[PDB]
Design a protein around this ligand. Structure first.
Ligand SMILES: *[C@@H]1O[C@H](CO)[C@@H](O[C@@H]2O[C@H](CO)[C@@H](O[C@@H]3O[C@H](CO)[C@@H](O)[C@H](O)[C@@H]3O)[C@H](O)[C@H]2NC(C)=O)[C@H](O)[C@H]1NC(C)=O
Ligand SMILES: *[C@@H]1O[C@H](CO)[C@@H](O[C@@H]2O[C@H](CO)[C@@H](O[C@@H]3O[C@H](CO)[C@@H](O)[C@H](O)[C@@H]3O)[C@H](O)[C@H]2NC(C)=O)[C@H](O)[C@H]1NC(C)=O
Lengths: 82, 109, 40, 109
């Protein structure tokens, strides 16, 4: 009953004053972006244009210190509009 | 007072504070998205491309306890532009190569 | 008058409080929409 | 530690009051835009179409006094959405037939 309210409160309190123009750790650290690919399908290859099509899930991960939070659960699936 | 202003204020009260960034019953049990399809046509099938073109009316159906309203017996139908103000499932077609929602006059939603 | 300010404050009074989400005469009888086409 | 807030407020101070409409030193001497191109590849060259297709990295340099800052020694890289918040030259290719900026994951700016 209360979670869908306390998490909107948390998230609104999580990105107020948050600036997305800046890297996480802009002033102190290099940002290590862990990356991964799942190839859903490969091809077709084109000999005449010398190209090939590939369809993938492209996955990235990094740590943004601004967004660490405390709450009843340890992982939030957010709407991609965020 | 009156239906027009009454309905306007009811919808505003529904959407006031509605967080699109959280799914229905967030944190609780999963939301069940029932869906059904009416096929307009399969337009063409191509061996050289190993694909086919499908046109369909695609529909989805779920509860959002936040959008429950009282005092109005009607099934409210709203302009499609409300779709950008509501949470909707992230449904997608895995083997889709290329697709689009029809947009003549106004986007077909 | 022909004052453009008079027209502006007239249009703004039409749009103020206007809700695009609700059809004309909502809850009432259906809206009659008259189609017309000129073929190019 | 406090650098994050410091640089945030620095950038906000730069943008606050900044006018997109006016070129650097508007009314004063012209702005010098220096350009570089790194050719990625040249696609098909067509006699039948009397055209050729080119892919490149295209870079432009200019100085805008409104964006000077002193507290941060870094060459400050910013997310590409800032380009919509800054004046940028209206360079265009006078002999192009069809062209686009790449957007593979984010628009390549
Ligand atoms: C608002 O829409 C709902 C549907 O979302 C309408 O409720 C549905 O009304 C129909 C009758 O118009 C009900 O059908 C009946 O159902 C049973 C089987 O469940 C069967 O014995 C009958 O032959 C008949 O088909 C239907 O059950 C009911 N519910 C659903 C989920 O479809 C409602 O009438 C609409 N209200 C207004 C004011 O338009
Ligand atoms: C931020 O970017 C600027 C861009 O101008 C960097 O300036 C760099 O300054 C150095 C030092 O003057 C330039 O070195 C050049 O080297 C050769 C000798 O090796 C000589 O021919 C030139 O007289 C000149 O000194 C360098 O060209 C210049 N640009 C670049 C791209 O390095 C500056 O270093 C950057 N700062 C930081 C903190 O990253």
């Amino acid at each position: 009953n209360d979670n869908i309210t306390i998490f909107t409160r948390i998230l609104d309190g999580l990105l107020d004053g948050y600036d997305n123009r800046l890297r996480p750790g802009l002033g102190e650290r290099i940002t290590q972006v862990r990356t991964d690919i799942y190839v859903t399908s490969f091809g077709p290859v084109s000999d005449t244009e010398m190209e090939y099509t590939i369809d993938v899930f492209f996955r990235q991960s990094w740590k943004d210190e601004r967004l660490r939070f405390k709450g009843p659960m340890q992982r939030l699936p957010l709407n991609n509009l965020l | 007072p009156g239906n027009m202003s009454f309905v306007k204020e009811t919808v505003d009260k529904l959407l006031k504070g509605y967080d699109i960034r959280l799914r229905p019953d967030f944190g609780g049990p999963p939301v069940c998205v029932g869906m059904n399809i009416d096929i307009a046509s399969i337009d063409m099938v191509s061996e050289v491309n190993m694909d086919y073109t499908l046109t369909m009316y695609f529909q989805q159906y779920w509860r959002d306890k936040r959008l429950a309203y009282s005092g109005i017996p009607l099934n409210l139908t709203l302009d499609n532009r409300v779709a950008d103000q509501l949470w909707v499932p992230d449904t997608y077609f895995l083997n889709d190569k290329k697709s689009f929602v029809h947009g003549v006059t106004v986007k077909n939603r």
